[PDB]
């Protein structure tokens, strides 16, 4: 079985490259971040522009939702993260401590903690309420491209241009595992699977890999796309068929069957690299976003 994603809406508004898109956990909203220093909020089902959230001094590389859909956190070249109250648009806290660009960010499932990764080669863990840094992990020897908590928040996975994925104990800060396959390309993205068993990792050799975390083994590889330069997000799509979804440097969105590793669809429409994709939590909807020559976000919907 193959899905049939079809283009429904195109969202224009950002004035520079879009850097990340994320659906709110409650399914109502899409948040986007951009090199234009802005966060924009859009209706998840109709693509209707809702509001702009402003405050960063330089471009934003990542934005992420709290699990109750009330807060956002953003990571900026201004070397800060900002915590936002979405309803009021207020910047609640500015998280200062990284010594270089902040590249990636996420809340833990409880949403009492934020994890961040930076060009300063560290991972920081921050208290959401106080906006204060709790731990700094000397995690990598090159910029940190992604950070993500597991299902219960007890672990953090990080990835780096240094070619490593590392798993950290949230509470103690200890490195529990280092994962790397037979070659050492920069690792450009990682995240835990929805069930927490696996880690999905992208490397800048045109490859996505599914790792069994507990066993430290690569189980599956997904290929066919182009990814040698950009830190492109990847997703697990779970509302219909079980897919892996990723942007590509040939301007397409790729969708693979998770189990069989076959490509099941390619989405054409963007005019530049698709840097970010997101999958809606309840409906078969994919959001995709593109770089500077395009500047748009697209919403695609399928019957499977």
């Amino acid at each position: 079985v193959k899905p049939n994603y079809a283009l429904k809406f195109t969202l224009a508004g950002h004035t520079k490259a879009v850097s990340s898109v994320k659906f709110s956990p409650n399914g109502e909203w899409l948040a986007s971040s951009s090199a234009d220093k802005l966060i924009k909020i859009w209706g998840a089902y109709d693509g209707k522009f809702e509001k702009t959230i402003s405050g960063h001094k330089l471009g934003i590389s990542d934005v992420a939702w709290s699990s109750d859909s009330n807060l956002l956190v953003s990571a900026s070249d201004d070397k800060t993260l900002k915590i936002w109250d979405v309803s009021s648009g207020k910047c609640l806290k500015t998280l200062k401590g990284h010594s270089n660009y902040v590249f990636c960010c996420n809340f833990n499932p409880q949403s009492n903690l934020i994890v961040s990764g930076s060009f300063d080669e560290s991972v920081r863990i921050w208290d959401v309420k106080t906006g204060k840094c709790l731990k700094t992990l000397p995690a990598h020897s090159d910029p940190v491209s992604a950070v993500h908590f597991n299902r219960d928040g007890s672990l953090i996975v990080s990835s780096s241009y240094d070619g490593l994925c590392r798993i950290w104990d949230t509470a103690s800060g200890q490195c529990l595992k280092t994962l790397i396959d037979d070659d050492n390309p920069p690792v450009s993205f990682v995240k835990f699977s929805p069930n927490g068993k696996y880690i999905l990792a992208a490397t800048l050799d045109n490859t996505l890999k599914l790792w069994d975390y507990s066993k430290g083994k690569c189980l599956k590889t997904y290929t066919g796309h182009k990814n040698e330069k950009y830190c492109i997000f990847a997703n697990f799509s779970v509302t219909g068929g079980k897919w892996i979804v990723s942007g590509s440097e040939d301007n397409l969105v790729y969708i693979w069957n998770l189990q069989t590793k076959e490509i099941v669809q390619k989405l054409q429409g963007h005019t530049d690299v698709v840097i970010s994709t997101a999958c809606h939590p309840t409906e078969n909807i994919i959001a995709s976003a593109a770089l500077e020559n395009d500047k748009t976000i697209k919403l695609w919907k399928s019957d499977c």
Binding site: S19, S34, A35, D36, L58, G59, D77, L204
Partner: peptide, 10 residues
């Protein structure tokens, strides 16, 4: 030059 680390690329 593109304005963010992620949109600039490796």
């Amino acid at each position: 030059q593109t304005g963010s680390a992620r949109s600039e690329g490796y």
